[PDB]
DNA sequence: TCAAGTACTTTTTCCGGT
RNA sequence: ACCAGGA
DNA sequence: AAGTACTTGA
């Protein structure tokens, strides 16, 4: 048995048109902009820049370690060792995907602290760009407004070049110097 | 990319578990099935968020058998790659055909032909490397790849990537 | 209401739905000699209001389909000049309960 | 769409069918080595245990009563009168 | 022995819903097919052993369910298909009421 | 044919009788909401006899020296004479019994008193008498209010339909109509005191038991009344042996909605 | 036993009826279905890659299915296909086809009447799919000309042009599997006198149906997704797998092919003829001949008992079992295999009354109890009892026949080498004998009653008859002039409860049929009860004492 | 309405003449079923079996194949609400015992 | 156009022997 | 599908 | 044997 979503469309007999996915910002049926939370309310898609994603998992796992111990009652190089321990504590271990992801996120995050990840999130979510672009701008580090507009081709007419460069400047400053 | 997605898995509990440690066994059974999973529809199900508030709901007792079916509503962090996605990764393997790059839970392979012409394979190196006039790509080295397409495959998702276009390659 | 002795020519009969909203009823004199509604077997039929009908369906959780039906041509539906969609409340004396009310929608 | 407790309108009493199905279900669960919520006072028949569990009103089950429109009222075996 | 139509009626009259299922399934016929969730047919090439599912025609290697129906019903359906009729089986609703 | 025609009919959780399309057949099962097993032929006393003898049975007139309940009937008998406030209650009572009697004669035109109704009251009183060792000598400890109002209350509790709305509520009132006539007749003030000779405790017990039994008597949602009805007409047809076509052939004639029937007749 | 499948188990909520589009038949199909020959790879007894298994289901029992790897009691069949050389009518839809032609222009595929006729927009308004079609037809049948211009929605002076085509419509009649029309014509205002008479081809009707607009066919009974009119005409024929048409393979080398398999090869053969005639030097009449034969076989395969009499007979004089025939009432799929079924855990013997049995019990002959079984789950409450019943074996009365392991594989106590040293584990099932006081369903057919099927307590006794209390005689309508009765054993705790809680004999005493008891005192007891209770009747102490001890719940007073 | 009245009177007489007594409700229900449609619906293949109930349910009496062919032609959807369909489907029918659902409440289970 | 004929459908309680 | 029986 | 459905003569 597999998992299902909040998307309930009744494709009766009429199979296809299973359209492609790109940086034409055409993602899946599943990864659409208008999503619906289990409370029933329409809620826009949640995309995370590596740094944002690292903290999220850490948070969830740390809180799981709180609940697991409660139920049982009756420096980047150094973050990696500490994370690999929390995984032995909370996760099934067998989940190599999570270990791999965590090692990757630890080694590839641009913003170390929640405070820093906050400013990134505010500064970026004010551009009106699709969560995908907004995350990609957090994940990939770019200098020329071109570097960005090249690697994130969806941006193409969405923002000014100087506007983007101003944002690229503030993101460079925010980078937590390992 | 890297999303938080609201999901729900149907679980069928055997009567022997209708004890007070029920929600406990249920939440754990979910984590077993769901976490570390890899579907194509949602990609890599990596980590179930907010354990303390997983919604078990009421479990309907299946008629001829004793068991109870629960639709465990939950929310989790996912990784779904896309064509056109520019990803930063680390080389893992290297051959005459190209090199594989570890991007999170997933591997992206770059063909000898999807790299600039100047960059050429070197067999006589430890470990095997790719050599440009100015650049050297090998096992420990970091690369920025553009995903050209994916193949949803069982317990994984693999992809072909390129470093031939602008702003791509060794970082 | 038009009361006629023997017949109304199909020439004249074609001018009946001619003047809406206003409605016209043809009644052969010979039928009306005896009031059917007066008969032993004939219970009280009550034409419901639009509001009354709305409530009936609300209270029983019914789609109009799910209600018992009275034919548009029914001697009582004719006596009351029932129009398609209109509902009647039928009050019969029950040997079981003393009083029982059925409902019939028009056809 | 699920009728709220304060707006329920079905019998406050358990039907013959409900009681029969509950006793059936419990016997089936007890027989499948399920945890028993009553003090078996030397009992062995899963049905006789179920009867005892229903008597002590320690059955953790809920009857979902469907109405012809599709809607439903949820009633607990704890709250259901057993005059049957 | 034959648990016939007339016997089925008494069971219906009693309201012995599970007893009836047990006669008609467990005590007789009872079979397991895999159906496709798009075309509600018994098309599925369930290589249950390798966990491979598939329904070419729908190219559905995912949206597949398993169901418990009397073998005689699997038969009836296959027979209706033989005569060009589609008895499409669905595991969810769409009509309401 | 009968079974195949009725199969899908059952009582839903709204006491309504519906088929597999949820179309209403009956609003309430068998027009009363009761299970056929829980019904017994009872006599609706009120219905017959002389207008004269009815009065002797039912009427209580505390403002008349001869038509008052003798103080041998109840303790209050002495102090009840000429009580105008109580005579309002007994006139209400009697005016309803007279109403009932008319309505009953409208339902049952021939005056047939024996009708199957739930809760055999005759038996409840019988038992109250052996249970409480009822002394057909000593005066009762009952008040006129105890009886008059007590019966008015039990009535409010004979529940078939539960909904909080006029439609469903009038539906309940109607469903219970006939039973209440029987109830009001068998539990009128003069009857209770002079005939049954009940004590308060016995009368209170008679009251709880009518309620208990009535409630037990209502049909259970799930009841496959389609098959039941079909089989209840079917089975007897098998035991089947002016001159009109009758029995099995006339039954076949009926169910078929035979246009060209064998013995057409008019009864003028 | 069937194997574990990772697929999510569900229930059927809706059955969406419809028709197969040829495209679908080709898509779902696992093979096509080229040679009438069953198998014998040039007599080499093994299935031919051409008819029954050119990838389909399975024969041999040993040797798995070629598509799913499952094999016999797991593998449902797999459908195939035959591509027909010419279109053919589906016997069933032959008249609906006729009626659709009657409603539409046999040249432009437009509804003969529309929103411009008042009675038509009235009929179109009908919500009921079947009733609407019913009304459209009675209107459109008589419209013998496809109109170009009809009078406007205001005045007859100005005529508004609807759809084009001014062609005259044929007067269609059936000629047994053939649709033949008769167009009046015009010729100097008259003609007919003598109209044009020609058969309407399957392909021409197909092309008209193909041209009927979605909006139009949807006004008629049709559905643009599940049943388009173009699908009533067969192009690509689905081939049912062996499970549908199993060979009754006697001995080792002796075929025994099904009736459906032969009728299919007939179609196959009739198709190959046609295809080669049109591919080769087409002698024009030779084709409308071989075509009419293929139409015949495709018709008779589905329904053999057609009005235009000539029944397709098997070489024996005996006619061919149609698919229609398979499904038709009482005996046959619906009524005989689905509404009613032969069942396991059933017993039948001669009944005889017993005054020493209790009202609610039933005397069960030892032999019957020793056969009939209940699958009891090894629980700590019964572990010891069950271990002894197993020890006891299938031959002794309180004993068992099988032990079901966690693994799912059945242990036969009759033969297992480890039948003694068997060591029970919680969660195993022990298939024990039918024992005293188990609830069982007792029945006496006809069964015109709720009461004809009652739940009784078991009572294992000697002698080959079912024993019943005399007062329970009436509900069943039983007597002992040689009546036999049926017993059914529930297999679950769930079903056991259903019986004991709803169907039990005591519960059945007062019947809702007539609001009075359906069981009373009878025969000897009714006779002796009068005799005992006369004023004249007195009993001496000696007997009184025995009469007293006989009442099982006598106070001892 | 008077049609129903007569229909009962007549049905009742067939039973009563034979001596037999059947409780009102049974005859009432049959009589009502024939009536609720608007007219006199026969207990034949032309009457009740031609109603808008489920194809499979209807196919189980008198016209089997013919009914099923029409189901295909009109692309009928069986609701699967009737007894007969569930019987055919080998499912628990929404009959008495199956007229409601049973669920485990984790809350009360953690309470006992 | 409306009555009369023709087609053609359709059922029948459960348990040795070709 | 037939034939012969049983309640 | 008894209906529906459709076709045929006045
Ligand atoms: Mg006999
Ligand atoms: Zn499919
Ligand atoms: Zn296979
Ligand atoms: Zn045209």
Give the other-Cβ count within 10 Å of G143's Cβ.
17
| Test the G interface: residue of E8, E9, E10, E34 with most G CBs within 10 Å | E10
End-to-end Cα spacing for chain G: 60
Buried b (16+ CB within 10 A) or exposed e, D10-48: bbebbbbbbbbbbbbbbbbbbbbbbbbbbeeeebebbbe
Cross-strand pairs, B58: none
Does the domain at D1-84 match CATH 3.90.940.10? Answer given as yes
End-to-end Cα spacing for chain H: 56
Strands G453-461 and G361-365: parallel
Query: Domain holding B102: CATH number?
Result: 2.40.50.140
For chain C, the chains sharing at least 3 beta-carbon pairs closer than 8 angstroms are D, F, H
Q: For chain A, what is the radius of gyration of the CA atoms? A: 19
Last residue of a domain, one of B82, B106, B126: B82
Q: Under CATH, what is the fold of the domain E1-85?
A: DCoH-like (3.90.1800)
The three-class DSSP label of residue A169 is: helix
> B105 and B152 share a domain?
yes
Strands G400-404 and G429-433: antiparallel
- C1' of K4 to CA of H50 (Å): 12
Chain E contact present for H93, CB below 8 A: yes
Q: Which helix (H) or strand (E) holds B129?
A: strand B129-131
Query: Domain holding B65: CATH number?
Result: 3.30.1490.120
Residue in A closest to E36 by C-alpha: A13
Chain G contact present for E5, CB below 8 A: yes
Which string of DSSP letters, residue by residue, matches G278-302?
HHS---THHHHHHHHHHHHHHHHHH
- Asked whether G490 and G496 are in contact (CB, 8 A), the reply is yes
Q: Which helix (H) or strand (E) holds B157?
A: strand B156-162
Say how far apart CA G400 and CA G413 lie, in whole Å. Answer: 8
Say how far apart CA A13 and CA E95 lie, in whole Å. Answer: 16
Say how far apart CA C50 and CA F188 lie, in whole Å. Answer: 43
> B69 and B133 share a domain?
no
The three-class DSSP label of residue F82 is: coil
Say how far apart CA F147 and CA F204 lie, in whole Å. Answer: 9
The alpha-helical segments, DSSP class H, found in G176-302 are 202-210, 214-219, 259-279, 285-302
Residue in D closest to G425 by C-alpha: D33
> For G38, phi and psi rounded to 5 degrees?
-65, -65
Say how far apart CA F59 and CA G440 lie, in whole Å. Answer: 58
Chain B contact present for A151, CB below 8 A: yes
Domain range annotation of chain A: 1-47, 48-72+75-178
Q: Which domain holds residue B41?
A: 1-82
Say how far apart CA G11 and CA H91 lie, in whole Å. Answer: 7
E13 contacts in chain F (CB < 8 Å) = 224, 227-228, 231
Token pair listed for H57 = 């349910």
From residue A106, alpha-carbon distances to A52, G24, G37, G233 in Å are: 11, 52, 68, 65
Say how far apart CA A136 and CA B167 lie, in whole Å. Answer: 15
Strands G361-365 and G510-511: unpaired
Task: Compute the nearest-CA separation of E31 from chain F (Å).
Answer: 26
Q: How far is the CA of G350 from the centre of ligand 1 (A)?
A: 11
Q: Which residue has the tokens 């937590």?
A: A176
CA angle (C38 as vertex; C37, C41 as ends), nearest 5: 80
> B166 and B132 share a domain?
yes
Does the domain at A48-72+75-178 match CATH 3.30.420.40? Answer given as no
| Number of the ligand closest to the Cα of G479 | 1
From residue B71, alpha-carbon distances to B14, B56, B60, D70 in Å are: 15, 7, 9, 20
Give the other-Cβ count within 10 Å of F216's Cβ.
14
End-to-end Cα spacing for chain F: 34
HEC string of G36-99?
Answer: CCCCCCCCCCCCCECECCCCCCCCCCCCCCCCCCCCCCCCCCCCEEEEEEEEEECHHHHHHHHH
Q: Which of G9, G334, G337 has the CB atom closest to E66's CB atom?
A: G9
Token pair listed for F147 = 């009886």
- C1' of K9 to CA of B114 (Å): 88
Say how far apart CA G428 and CA G431 lie, in whole Å. Answer: 10
Q: Which residue has the tokens 């059927």?
A: G12
* Residue G193 preceded by cis peptide, ω within 30: yes
Q: How far is the CA of G216 from the centre of ligand 4 (A)?
A: 13
Domain range annotation of chain E: 1-85
Residue in A closest to B79 by C-alpha: A101
Strands B129-131 and B3-13: unpaired
Nearest nt to the CA of G319 via C1' is J1
Query: CB-based burial of residue G175 (10 Å sphere; 0-12 exposed, 13-18 middle, 19+ buried)?
Result: exposed
Of A135, H27, H85, give the one whose Cα is nearest residue G13: H85
Q: What technique determined this structure?
A: X-ray
With the C-alpha atoms ordered G63, G68, G73, G78, is the resulting torsion angle positive or negative?
negative
> B78 and B1 share a domain?
yes
Packing angle between helix F121-132 and helix F200-217, nearest 10 degrees? 140
Residue ranges with CB less than 5 Å from ion ligand 3: G 65, 67-68, 75, 78
Say how far apart CA G58 and CA G65 lie, in whole Å. Answer: 5
- Check G448 against F35: CB less than 8 A apart: no
Token pair listed for F116 = 């199957």
Q: Which nucleotides of I are covered by protein (CB under 7 A)?
A: 7-15
Residues 6+ apart with CB under 8 A from G420: G391
> B78 and B95 share a domain?
no
> B55 and B40 share a domain?
yes
Token pair listed for D3 = 């009728």
Q: For chain E, what is the radius of gyration of the CA atoms? A: 16
HSE value, Cβ hemisphere, 13 Å, CA-based, for G128: 10
Q: Which of D19, D28, D43 has the CB atom closest to G494's CB atom?
A: D28
CA B123 from centre of chain: 30
Q: Which nucleotides of K are covered by protein (CB under 7 A)?
A: 2-4, 7
Which string of DSSP letters, residue by residue, matches A153-165?
GGGTTTS-HHHHH
Last residue of a domain, one of B55, B82, B109: B82
Say how far apart CA D30 and CA D13 lie, in whole Å. Answer: 25
Has G65 been labeled as part of a binding site? Answer: yes
Longest dimension (CA), chain B: 72
HSE value, Cβ hemisphere, 13 Å, CA-based, for F190: 18
Task: Compute the nearest-CA separation of D65 from chain C (Å).
Answer: 15
Of A119, F208, F6, give the one whose Cα is nearest residue H57: F6
Has G165 been labeled as part of a binding site? Answer: yes
- Which residue lies nearest I12, CA-to-C1' measured? G330
Q: Which nucleotides of J are covered by protein (CB under 7 A)?
A: 6-7
Which string of DSSP letters, residue by residue, matches B27-93?
HHHHHHHHTT-B-SSS-EEEEE--GGG-B--PEEEPSSS--EEEEEEEEEEEE---TT-EEEEEEEE
Residues 6+ apart with CB under 8 A from E54: E44, E45, E47, E60, E61, E64
- C1' of I11 to CA of G145 (Å): 44
The three-class DSSP label of residue G350 is: strand
Q: How many distinct structural domains can be found in chain B?
A: 2
Residues 6+ apart with CB under 8 A from F216: D83, F38
- Check G335 against H64: CB less than 8 A apart: yes
End-to-end Cα spacing for chain A: 43
Give the other-Cβ count within 10 Å of G235's Cβ.
20
Of A110, A60, A49, give the one whose Cα is nearest residue A86: A60
Of G375, H2, A24, G496, give the one whose Cα is nearest residue D48: G496
Chain C contact present for H23, CB below 8 A: no
- Asked whether B115 and A55 are in contact (CB, 8 A), the reply is no
Query: CB-based burial of residue B92 (10 Å sphere; 0-12 exposed, 13-18 middle, 19+ buried)?
Result: middle
From residue G98, alpha-carbon distances to G201, G524, H74 in Å are: 12, 71, 16
Strands C87-92 and G516-517: unpaired
Strands B106-111 and B169-170: unpaired
The three-class DSSP label of residue D83 is: coil
Residue in D closest to E97 by C-alpha: D69
> For G71, phi and psi rounded to 5 degrees?
75, 130
Chain C contact present for D68, CB below 8 A: yes
Q: How far is the CA of C102 from the centre of ligand 4 (A)?
A: 51
Q: Which of H98, H102, H109 has the CB atom closest to B18's CB atom?
A: H109
Nearest nt to the CA of G445 via C1' is I14
Chain G contact present for E43, CB below 8 A: yes
Residue in D closest to C57 by C-alpha: D69
> For B108, phi and psi rounded to 5 degrees?
-115, 120
> B48 and B87 share a domain?
no
For chain F, the chains sharing at least 3 beta-carbon pairs closer than 8 angstroms are C, D, E, G, H
Q: Which of C41, C71, C96 has the CB atom closest to H2's CB atom?
A: C41
Of G39, H55, G260, G67, give the one whose Cα is nearest residue E42: G67
- Asked whether D17 and H101 are in contact (CB, 8 A), the reply is no
> B154 and B108 share a domain?
yes
* Residue G446 preceded by cis peptide, ω within 30: yes
Q: How far is the CA of G30 from the centre of ligand 2 (A)?
A: 13
End-to-end Cα spacing for chain D: 30
> B46 and B67 share a domain?
yes
Give the other-Cβ count within 10 Å of H88's Cβ.
30
| G331 Cβ nearer than 7 Å to chain J strand | no
Checking G157-160 for CB contacts under 8 A at 24+ apart, the result is G160/G116
Cross-strand pairs, G407: none
Say how far apart CA B131 and CA B124 lie, in whole Å. Answer: 11
- Check G494 against B64: CB less than 8 A apart: yes
Q: Which helix (H) or strand (E) holds F211?
A: helix F200-217
In residues, how long is chain C? 107
Residue in G closest to F235 by C-alpha: G448
Which string of DSSP letters, residue by residue, matches H71-104?
HHHHT-EE---SHHHHHHHT---SSGGGSSEEEE
- C1' of I11 to CA of A162 (Å): 89
Residue ranges with CB less than 5 Å from ion ligand 2: E 36, 38-39, 43, 55, 58
Say how far apart CA G313 and CA G298 lie, in whole Å. Answer: 14
* Residue A17 preceded by cis peptide, ω within 30: yes
Say how far apart CA H13 and CA H15 lie, in whole Å. Answer: 5
G334 secondary structure, DSSP code: I
């Amino acid at each position: 048995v597999s998992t299902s979503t909040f998307q309930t469309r009744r494709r009766r007999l009429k199979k296809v048109e299973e359209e492609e996915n790109a940086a034409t910002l055409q993602l899946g049926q599943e990864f659409q902009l208008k999503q619906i939370n289990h409370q029933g309310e329409e809620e826009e898609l949640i995309a995370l820049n590596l740094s944002e994603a690292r903290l999220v998992i850490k948070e969830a796992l740390v809180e799981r370690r709180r609940a697991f111990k409660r139920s049982q009652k009756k420096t980047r190089e150094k973050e990696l060792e500490s994370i690999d321990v929390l995984l032995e504590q909370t996760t099934g271990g067998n989940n190599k995907d999570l270990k791999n992801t965590m090692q990757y996120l630890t080694n590839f995050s641009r913003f170390r602290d929640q405070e820093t990840v906050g400013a990134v999130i505010q500064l970026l979510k004010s551009t009106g760009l699709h969560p995908f672009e907004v995350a990609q701008l957090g994940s990939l580090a770019c200098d020329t407004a071109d570097e960005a507009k090249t690697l994130i081709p969806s941006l193409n007419n969405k923002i000014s070049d100087d506007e983007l460069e101003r944002i690229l400047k503030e993101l460079s400053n925010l980078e937590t110097l390992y | 990319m890297f999303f938080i997605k609201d999901l729900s898995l149907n679980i069928t509990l055997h009567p022997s578990f209708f004890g007070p440690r029920m929600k406990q066994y249920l939440k754990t059974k979910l984590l077993e099935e769901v976490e570390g999973s890899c579907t194509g529809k949602f990609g890599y199900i990596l980590c179930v968020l907010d354990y303390d508030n997983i919604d078990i709901q009421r479990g309907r007792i299946l008629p001829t058998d004793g068991s109870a079916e629960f639709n465990v509503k939950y929310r989790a962090v996912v990784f779904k790659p896309f064509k056109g996605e520019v990803v930063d990764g680390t080389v893992v393997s290297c051959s005459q055909h190209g090199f594989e790059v570890q991007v999170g839970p997933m591997k992206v392979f770059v063909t000898k032909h999807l790299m600039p012409q100047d960059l050429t394979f070197n067999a006589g190196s430890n470990p095997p490397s790719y050599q440009s006039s100015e650049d050297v790509i090998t096992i420990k080295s970091r690369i920025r790849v553009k995903i050209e397409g994916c193949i949803s495959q069982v317990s994984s998702i693999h992809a072909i990537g390129s470093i031939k276009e602008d702003y791509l390659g060794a970082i | 209401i038009f009361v006629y002795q023997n017949n109304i020519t199909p020439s004249a009969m074609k001018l009946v739905p001619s003047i809406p909203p206003a409605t016209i009823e043809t009644f052969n004199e010979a039928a009306l000699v005896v009031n059917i509604t007066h008969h032993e077997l004939v219970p009280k039929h009550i034409r419901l209001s639009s509001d009354e009908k709305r409530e009936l369906l609300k209270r029983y959780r019914l789609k109009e389909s799910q209600l018992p039906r009275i034919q548009r041509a029914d001697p009582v539906a004719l006596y009351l000049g029932l129009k398609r969609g209109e509902v009647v409340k039928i009050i019969r004396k029950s040997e079981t309960s003393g009083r029982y009310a059925s409902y019939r929608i028009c056809m | 769409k699920a009728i709220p407790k304060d707006q329920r309108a079905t019998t406050p009493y358990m039907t013959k069918y409900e009681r029969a199905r509950i006793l059936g279900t419990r016997a089936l669960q007890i027989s499948m080595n399920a945890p028993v919520f009553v003090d078996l006072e030397g009992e062995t028949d899963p049905l006789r245990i179920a009867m005892k569990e229903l008597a002590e009103k320690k059955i953790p089950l809920v009857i979902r009563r469907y109405l012809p429109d599709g809607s439903f009222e949820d009633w607990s075996v704890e709250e259901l009168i057993v005059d049957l | 022995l034959r648990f016939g139509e007339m016997e089925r009626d008494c069971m219906i009259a009693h309201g012995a819903a599970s007893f009836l299922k047990e006669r008609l399934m467990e005590a007789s016929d009872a079979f397991r097919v895999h159906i496709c969730g798009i075309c509600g047919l018994m098309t599925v090439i369930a290589k249950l052993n390798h966990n491979q599912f598939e329904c070419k025609g729908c190219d559905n290697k995912i949206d597949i369910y398993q169901i418990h129906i009397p073998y005689a019903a699997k038969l009836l359906f296959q027979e209706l298909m033989a005569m060009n009729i589609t008895p499409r089986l669905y595991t969810d609703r769409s009509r309401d009421f | 044919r009968l079974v195949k025609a009725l199969e899908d009919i059952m009582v839903h959780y709204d006491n309504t009788t519906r088929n597999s399309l949820g179309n209403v057949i009956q609003f309430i099962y068998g027009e009363d909401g009761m299970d056929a097993a829980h019904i017994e032929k009872q006599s609706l006393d009120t219905i017959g006899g002389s207008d004269a003898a009815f009065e002797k049975r039912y009427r209580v007139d505390l403002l008349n020296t001869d038509h008052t309940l003798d103080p041998s009937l109840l303790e209050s008998g002495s102090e009840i004479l000429g009580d105008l406030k109580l005579q309002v209650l007994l006139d209400e009572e009697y005016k309803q019994l007279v109403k009932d009697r008319k309505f009953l004669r409208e339902v049952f035109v021939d005056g047939e008193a024996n009708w199957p109704l739930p809760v055999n009251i005759r038996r409840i009183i019988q038992n109250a008498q052996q249970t409480f060792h009822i002394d057909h000598t000593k005066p009762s400890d009952l008040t006129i209010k105890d009886i008059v109002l007590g019966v008015k209350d039990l009535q409010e509790n004979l529940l078939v339909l539960r909904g909080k709305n006029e439609i469903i509520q009038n539906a309940q009132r109607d469903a219970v109509t006939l039973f209440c006539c029987l109830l009001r007749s068998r539990l009128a003030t003069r009857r209770v005191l002079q005939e049954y000779r009940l004590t308060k405790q016995a009368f209170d017990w008679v009251l709880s038991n009518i309620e208990a039994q009535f409630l037990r008597s209502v049909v259970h949602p799930g009841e496959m009344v389609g098959v039941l009805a079909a089989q209840s007409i079917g089975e007897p047809a098998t035991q089947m042996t002016k001159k009109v076509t009758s029995g099995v052939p006339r039954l076949k004639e009926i169910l078929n909605v035979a246009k060209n029937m064998k013995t057409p007749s008019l009864t003028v | 036993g069937q194997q574990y499948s990772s697929a999510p188990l569900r229930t059927v909520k809706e059955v969406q009826f419809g028709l197969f589009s040829p495209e679908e038949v080709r898509a779902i199909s696992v093979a096509k279905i080229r040679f009438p020959e069953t198998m014998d790879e040039t007599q080499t007894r093994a299935k031919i890659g051409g008819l029954n298994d050119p990838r389909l289901g399975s024969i041999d029992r040993n040797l798995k299915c070629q598509t799913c790897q499952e094999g016999m009691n797991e593998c449902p069949g797999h459908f195939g296909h035959i591509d027909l050389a010419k279109p053919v009518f589906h016997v069933g839809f032959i008249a609906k086809i006729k009626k659709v032609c009657e409603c539409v222009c046999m040249h432009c595929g437009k509804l003969l009447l529309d929103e411009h006729n008042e009675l038509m927009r009235q009929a179109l308004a009908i919500k009921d799919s079947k009733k609407r079609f019913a009304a459209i037809w009675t209107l459109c049948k008589t419209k013998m000309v496809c109109e170009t211009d009809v009078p406007s929605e205001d005045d007859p002076t100005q005529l508004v042009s609807r759809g084009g085509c001014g062609n005259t419509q044929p007067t269609i009649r059936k000629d047994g599997l053939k649709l033949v029309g008769s167009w009046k014509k015009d010729r100097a205002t008259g003609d007919a006198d003598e109209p044009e008479l020609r058969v309407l081809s399957t392909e021409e009707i197909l092309n008209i149906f193909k041209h009927i607009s979605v909006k139009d066919f949807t006004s008629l009974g049709f559905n643009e997704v599940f049943s388009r009119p173009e699908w009533m005409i067969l192009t690509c024929l689905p081939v049912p797998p062996p499970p549908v048409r199993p060979s009754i393979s006697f001995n080792e080398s002796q075929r025994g092919e099904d009736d459906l398999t032969f009728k299919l090869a007939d179609i196959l053969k009739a198709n190959i003829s046609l295809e080669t005639l049109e591919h080769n030097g087409a002698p024009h009449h030779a084709i409308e001949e071989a075509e009419s034969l293929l139409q015949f076989h495709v018709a008779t395969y589905m329904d053999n008992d057609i009005a235009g009499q000539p029944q397709a007979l098997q070489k024996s004089g005996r006619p061919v079992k149609s698919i229609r025939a398979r499904l038709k009432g009482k005996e046959g799929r619906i009524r005989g295999n689905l509404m009613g079924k032969r069942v396991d855990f059933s017993a039948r013997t001669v009944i005889s009354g017993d005054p020493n049995l209790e009202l609610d019990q039933v005397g069960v002959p030892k032999s019957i109890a020793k056969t009939l079984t209940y699958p009891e789950v090894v629980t700590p409450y019964n572990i010891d009892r069950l271990t002894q019943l197993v020890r006891n074996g299938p031959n002794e009365h309180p004993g068992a026949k099988y032990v079901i392991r966690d693994s799912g594989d059945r242990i036969d106590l009759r033969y297992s080498k480890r039948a003694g040293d068997i060591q029970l584990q919680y969660g195993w099932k022990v298939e024990r004998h039918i024992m005293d006081n188990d609830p069982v369903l007792f029945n006496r057919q006809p069964s015109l009653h709720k009461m004809s099927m009652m739940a009784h307590r078991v009572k294992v006794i000697p002698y080959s008859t079912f024993r019943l209390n005399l007062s329970v005689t009436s509900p069943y309508n039983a007597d002992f002039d040689g009546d036999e009765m049926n017993l059914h054993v529930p297999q679950s705790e769930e079903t056991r409860a259903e019986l004991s809680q709803l169907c039990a004999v005591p519960l059945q005493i007062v019947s809702p049929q007539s609001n009075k008891p359906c069981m009373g005192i009878v025969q000897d007891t009714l006779c002796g009860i009068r005799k005992l209770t006369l004023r004249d009747t007195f009993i001496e102490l000696d007997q009184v004492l025995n009469m007293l001890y006989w009442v099982p719940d006598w106070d001892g007073v | 309405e008077a049609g129903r009245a007569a229909l009962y009177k007549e049905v009742y007489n067939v039973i009563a003449s034979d001596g037999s007594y059947v409780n009102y409700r049974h005859m009432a229900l049959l009589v009502d079923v024939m009536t609720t449609q608007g007219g006199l619906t026969s207990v034949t293949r032309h009457g009740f079996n031609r109603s808008n109930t489920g194809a499979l349910m209807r196919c189980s009496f008198e016209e089997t194949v013919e009914i099923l062919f029409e189901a295909g032609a009109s692309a009928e959807l069986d609701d699967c609400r009737g007894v007969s369909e569930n019987v055919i489907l080998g499912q628990m029918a929404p009959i008495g015992t199956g007229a409601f659902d049973v669920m485990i409440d984790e809350e009360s289970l953690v309470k006992y």
